[PDB]
Design an enzyme around this catalytic site. Structure first.
Site, PDB file in Angstrom:
ATOM      1  N   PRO A  15     -28.766  -9.774   0.800  1.00  0.00           N
ATOM      2  CA  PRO A  15     -28.190  -8.812   1.747  1.00  0.00           C
ATOM      3  C   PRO A  15     -27.036  -8.057   1.109  1.00  0.00           C
ATOM      4  O   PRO A  15     -26.666  -8.325  -0.038  1.00  0.00           O
ATOM      5  CB  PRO A  15     -27.724  -9.698   2.901  1.00  0.00           C
ATOM      6  CG  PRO A  15     -27.323 -10.986   2.187  1.00  0.00           C
ATOM      7  CD  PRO A  15     -28.477 -11.163   1.206  1.00  0.00           C
ATOM      8  N   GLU A  81     -30.491  -0.315  -5.967  1.00  0.00           N
ATOM      9  CA  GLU A  81     -30.828   0.130  -4.607  1.00  0.00           C
ATOM     10  C   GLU A  81     -32.303   0.458  -4.462  1.00  0.00           C
ATOM     11  O   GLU A  81     -32.666   1.480  -3.878  1.00  0.00           O
ATOM     12  CB  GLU A  81     -30.012   1.375  -4.239  1.00  0.00           C
ATOM     13  CG  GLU A  81     -28.513   1.172  -4.230  1.00  0.00           C
ATOM     14  CD  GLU A  81     -27.759   2.453  -3.904  1.00  0.00           C
ATOM     15  OE1 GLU A  81     -28.011   3.039  -2.829  1.00  0.00           O
ATOM     16  OE2 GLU A  81     -26.917   2.874  -4.727  1.00  0.00           O
TER      17      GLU A  81
HETATM   18  N1  LIG Z   1     -19.290 -11.120   2.956  1.00  0.00           N
HETATM   19  C1  LIG Z   1     -19.148 -11.071   1.674  1.00  0.00           C
HETATM   20  N2  LIG Z   1     -19.755 -12.025   0.864  1.00  0.00           N
HETATM   21  C2  LIG Z   1     -19.645 -12.035  -0.533  1.00  0.00           C
HETATM   22  N3  LIG Z   1     -18.954 -11.132  -1.217  1.00  0.00           N
HETATM   23  C3  LIG Z   1     -18.344 -10.184  -0.458  1.00  0.00           C
HETATM   24  C4  LIG Z   1     -18.391 -10.083   0.937  1.00  0.00           C
HETATM   25  N4  LIG Z   1     -17.672  -9.016   1.381  1.00  0.00           N
HETATM   26  C5  LIG Z   1     -17.186  -8.467   0.260  1.00  0.00           C
HETATM   27  N5  LIG Z   1     -17.555  -9.123  -0.875  1.00  0.00           N
HETATM   28  C6  LIG Z   1     -17.150  -8.714  -2.281  1.00  0.00           C
HETATM   29  O1  LIG Z   1     -18.042  -7.691  -2.680  1.00  0.00           O
HETATM   30  C7  LIG Z   1     -18.761  -7.986  -3.903  1.00  0.00           C
HETATM   31  C8  LIG Z   1     -20.173  -7.454  -3.652  1.00  0.00           C
HETATM   32  O2  LIG Z   1     -20.999  -7.218  -4.816  1.00  0.00           O
HETATM   33  P1  LIG Z   1     -22.013  -5.989  -4.852  1.00  0.00           P
HETATM   34  O3  LIG Z   1     -22.673  -6.142  -6.203  1.00  0.00           O
HETATM   35  O4  LIG Z   1     -21.422  -4.644  -4.601  1.00  0.00           O
HETATM   36  O5  LIG Z   1     -23.027  -6.328  -3.698  1.00  0.00           O
HETATM   37  P2  LIG Z   1     -24.492  -5.779  -3.377  1.00  0.00           P
HETATM   38  O6  LIG Z   1     -24.889  -4.744  -4.489  1.00  0.00           O
HETATM   39  O7  LIG Z   1     -25.372  -6.999  -3.343  1.00  0.00           O
HETATM   40  O8  LIG Z   1     -24.359  -5.110  -2.054  1.00  0.00           O
HETATM   41  C9  LIG Z   1     -18.591  -9.516  -4.066  1.00  0.00           C
HETATM   42  O9  LIG Z   1     -18.608  -9.855  -5.472  1.00  0.00           O
HETATM   43  C10 LIG Z   1     -17.264  -9.804  -3.342  1.00  0.00           C
HETATM   44  O10 LIG Z   1     -16.122  -9.723  -4.224  1.00  0.00           O
END
Ligand SMILES: Nc1ncnc2c1ncn2[C@@H]1O[C@H](COP(=O)(O)OP(=O)(O)O)[C@@H](O)[C@H]1O
Ligand SMILES: Nc1ncnc2c1ncn2[C@@H]1O[C@H](COP(=O)(O)OP(=O)(O)O)[C@@H](O)[C@H]1O
Ligand SMILES: [Zn+2]
Ligand SMILES: [Zn+2]
EC number: 2.7.1.21
Lengths: 178, 166
Positions: A15, A81
Site C-alpha cells: 500500500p 507507480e
Molecule cells: N504509515 C506509514 N507507514 C510506513 N512508513 C510511513 C508511513 N507514513 C509515512 N511513512 C514514511 O514514508 C516512507 C514511504 O516510502 P515510499 O517509498 O515513498 O512509499 P511508497 O512508494 O510505497 O508509497 C517510509 O519509508 C516512512 O519513512
C-alpha cells in the site's frame, strides 16, 4: 542464479507508504554500483520517496513509450507507480525479460477499496520475484497492508469516483463503507 | 502481530514440483501443534467442487482454512477467501501461478493482489539445474503448442528453458 543474459521480472508491491519507491531506488543504485546500464520509467521526472531519496527517471505517457525510449544498451529497466499503466505493460515487461534483461516493477496491489489494482495482479503471477511489503498502520501500529482514502477526514464510499487524504492501514482498521 | 481474531490471507505459488504441497502441509502441521482447528479444501482433507461450497462445509469452530490447487477454482474464491479473513481467521492458499503456456492461471493474480503474505517458490529445472519457475507440458517428449487443449508429461523449467511453440 541470475546468470548473464538470463532475464526475469521482479515486483515490489504494497500500500501507499509501504516503501516501494525507497526499495526501487535502492535497487537502482545497486545496479549502478554493479556497473549495469539502467533506465528508469514513471508515468506522467524523478522517482521520489516519501522518506527523502530520489532517482532520475524518464516520464512516459503510456506503456508503449517504454519500447520507444528503450535502448538496447541497457541491462536493467526500472518502472515505478506501475498500477497506472494499461495492461500492455505486462507483455512488454515479459518481452524485456525474455530478451535476457532484468525488469523491476513497483506499484500498488489494491486501490483504496481494497480491490486488485490494474496490471500488478498479472505482473505478480508472471514475475520470478515478488516482494509484498507493508507500511505501519497509523491507527494501531500493526503492519499496514491497505491504503485508506479519506474525505473530510472520514472514509470514502466504495462506489465513490475520483478535503481528501491517504494513509496506510491494516486490514482491521481499513474502513470502506458501501 | 496477527494477534487474536485478526485474520489474513497468505498465498503459496510456483510451478509444479516447486514444493507448494510440502509447504502447505508443513504449515498445517504447525497450526495443529499450535492447537488450532483447521479445515482443508481442494478442487477435489476435504475434496469439494466450486468455491461457494466452502461456506457450506465451513465450521465456525475452525481458526485456519487451507485451500490447495487454488488456480482451479472460479473467481468467487477471491471473495470467499477475503470474507473468511475479514471474519478474523487465517486462510492459506496454494496454487500454480501460471499455466503451461506461462499465462496467469485463473484467480491467482487477484489472490496474490489481496493476500497479506505472498511466497513464490521455485522448483529445480530438469534441463539446466537453475531455479525453475515454469511448468513445461510435453506430448511425446515434445513441447506442447500454445493453443493445445487439455503420451503427456509435465516437468519444471527455467524461463530460458521453458519452450512454448506457437
Ligand atoms: N504509515 C506509514 N507507514 C510506513 N512508513 C510511513 C508511513 N507514513 C509515512 N511513512 C514514511 O514514508 C516512507 C514511504 O516510502 P515510499 O517509498 O515513498 O512509499 P511508497 O512508494 O510505497 O508509497 C517510509 O519509508 C516512512 O519513512
Ligand atoms: N524438478 C524438480 N524440482 C524440485 N523438486 C522436484 C522436482 N522433481 C521432483 N521433485 C521432488 O518433488 C517435491 C515437490 O513438492 P510438491 O509439494 O509435491 O510440489 P508442488 O505441490 O509445488 O507441485 C520436491 O520436494 C522434490 O523432492
Ligand atoms: Zn490497524
Ligand atoms: Zn533451465
Amino acid at each position: 542464479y541470475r546468470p548473464k543474459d538470463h532475464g526475469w521480472v521482479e515486483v515490489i508491491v504494497g500500500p501507499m507508504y509501504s516503501g516501494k519507491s525507497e526499495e526501487l531506488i535502492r535497487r537502482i543504485r545497486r545496479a549502478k554500483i554493479a556497473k549495469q546500464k539502467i533506465q528508469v520509467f514513471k508515468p506522467e521526472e524523478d522517482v521520489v520517496s516519501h522518506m527523502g531519496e530520489k532517482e532520475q527517471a524518464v516520464a512516459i505517457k503510456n506503456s508503449r513509450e517504454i519500447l520507444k525510449y528503450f535502448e538496447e544498451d541497457t541491462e536493467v529497466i526500472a518502472i515505478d507507480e506501475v498500477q497506472f499503466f494499461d495492461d500492455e505493460i505486462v507483455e512488454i515487461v515479459n518481452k524485456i525479460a525474455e530478451s535476457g534483461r532484468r525488469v523491476i516493477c513497483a506499484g500498488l496491489d489494491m486501490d483504496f477499496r481494497g480491490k486488485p489494482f490494474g496490471p500488478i495482479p498479472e505482473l505478480m503471477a508472471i514475475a520470478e520475484f515478488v516482494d509484498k511489503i507493508q507500511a505501519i498502520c497509523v491507527v494501531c501500529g500493526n503492519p499496514a497492508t491497505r491504503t485508506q482514502r479519506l474525505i473530510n477526514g472520514k472514509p470514502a464510499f466504495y462506489d465513490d469516483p475520483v478535503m481528501e487524504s491517504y494513509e496506510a492501514r491494516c486490514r482491521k482498521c481499513h474502513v470502506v463503507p458501501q
